[PDB]
Amino acid sequence: YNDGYDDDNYDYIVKNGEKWMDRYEIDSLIGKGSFGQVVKAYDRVEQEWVAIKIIKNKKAFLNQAQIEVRLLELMNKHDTEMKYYIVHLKRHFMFRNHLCLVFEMLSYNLYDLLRNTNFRGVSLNLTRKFAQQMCTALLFLATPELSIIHCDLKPENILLCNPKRSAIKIVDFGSSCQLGQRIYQYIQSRFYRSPEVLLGMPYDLAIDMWSLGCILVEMHTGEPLFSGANEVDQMNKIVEVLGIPPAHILDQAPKARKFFEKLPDGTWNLKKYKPPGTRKLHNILGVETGGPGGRRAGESGHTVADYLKFKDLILRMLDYDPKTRIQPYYALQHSFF
Ligand SMILES: CN(C)c1nccc(-c2c[nH]c3ncccc23)n1
Numbered sequence: 001y002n003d004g005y006d007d008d009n010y011d012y013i014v015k016n017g018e019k020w021m022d023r024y025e026i027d028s029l030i031g032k033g034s035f036g037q038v039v040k041a042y043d044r045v046e047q048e049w050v051a052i053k054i055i056k057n058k059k060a061f062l063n064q065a066q067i068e069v070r071l072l073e074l075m076n077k078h079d080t081e082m083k084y085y086i087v088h089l090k091r092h093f094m095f096r097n098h099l100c101l102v103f104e105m106l107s108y109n110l111y112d113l114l115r116n117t118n119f120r121g122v123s124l125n126l127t128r129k130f131a132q133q134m135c136t137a138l139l140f141l142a143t144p145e146l147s148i149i150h151c152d153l154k155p156e157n158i159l160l161c162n163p164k165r166s167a168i169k170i171v172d173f174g175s176s177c178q179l180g181q182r183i184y185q186y187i188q189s190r191f192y193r194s195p196e197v198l199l200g201m202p203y204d205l206a207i208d209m210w211s212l213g214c215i216l217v218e219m220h221t222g223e224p225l226f227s228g229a230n231e232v233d234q235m236n237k238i239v240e241v242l243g244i245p246p247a248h249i250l251d252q253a254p255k256a257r258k259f260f261e262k263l264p265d266g267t268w269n270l271k272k273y274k275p276p277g278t279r280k281l282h283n284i285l286g287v288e289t290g291g292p293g294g295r296r297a298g299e300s301g302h303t304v305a306d307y308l309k310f311k312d313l314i315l316r317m318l319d320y321d322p323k324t325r326i327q328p329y330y331a332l333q334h335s336f337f
Helices: 059-077 110-116 124-141 206-221 231-242 304-317 328-333
Strands: 024-033 036-043 048-055 089-095 098-103 158-160 168-170 260-262 268-270
Touching: 024 048, 048 059, 059 089, 059 098, 110 158, 110 206, 124 168, 124 206, 124 304, 124 328, 206 304, 304 328
Parallel strands: none
Antiparallel strands: 024 036, 036 048, 048 098, 089 098, 158 168, 260 268
């Protein structure tokens, strides 16, 4: 495959210590996924370690990464001080039939961090730090010259800069789009997928705020908020917590009847779970009962008052109506922060 350079998965066969382009010394593989691989490499010209994302030698993967490159170039252009929590693309090149994206080197992702908590969650204080950085990133993506919808926010796409610190960067803009050029109908990883997407309705940057609300709950509890096995199960899990979506939304939803049925009195119910709205976020978070699993009882930084502010912000991020769902500017002003 590829003159011996590739495996049968379209991946470049990594070789420890290989020199590329009279510039990079490849050290080791540090991550992998559907897109290809990420290697740690020494950039001998800039005298620093870098992460090189080696995209698969396969046209669909190449073109996904070309979208990613263009969006990163647009963003990084408007954030030269690296202050808006978006990963920094240093440069890119084609090498041995692989598109290669050279990034700053990052640490663990937030799913890795959840595993490191034994799936019991990070503290409310650390959750708040992640939330503030993520809302700042979403404010930046919403600036009009960007208008970027990430479209795949989830713990695995948020990386720590350093294992010992709370600073983060968002990665993976290969599935992203811009408000002016929305093309996709099928988007978002299932657990983090917004109701408007499930319902086949128009969408905008608010879909990323929905995902963020789901992510932040999971960061503190250790477990996904809405862990659907398929779209019907996903919507039913959302409904357990948040109730039946508003009629004015379902009346306009192309896929309303995948999940719901309209009664003679005009109201909507589920098609034949805990009853709608009875799995309270108040209890998932343990607002009055010592946090998730009661494990935060007797800990500082986890008061009822604190939890009530967190609950309020999350419920605003999980508004069914994308027009009234909280937006980044206002999330940042919320009393949780
Ligand atoms: C999808 N993905 C994993 C991805 N997409 C874009 C950038 C990065 C990335 C940048 N620096 C890193 N350092 C260590 C590990 C990964 C990365 N990872």
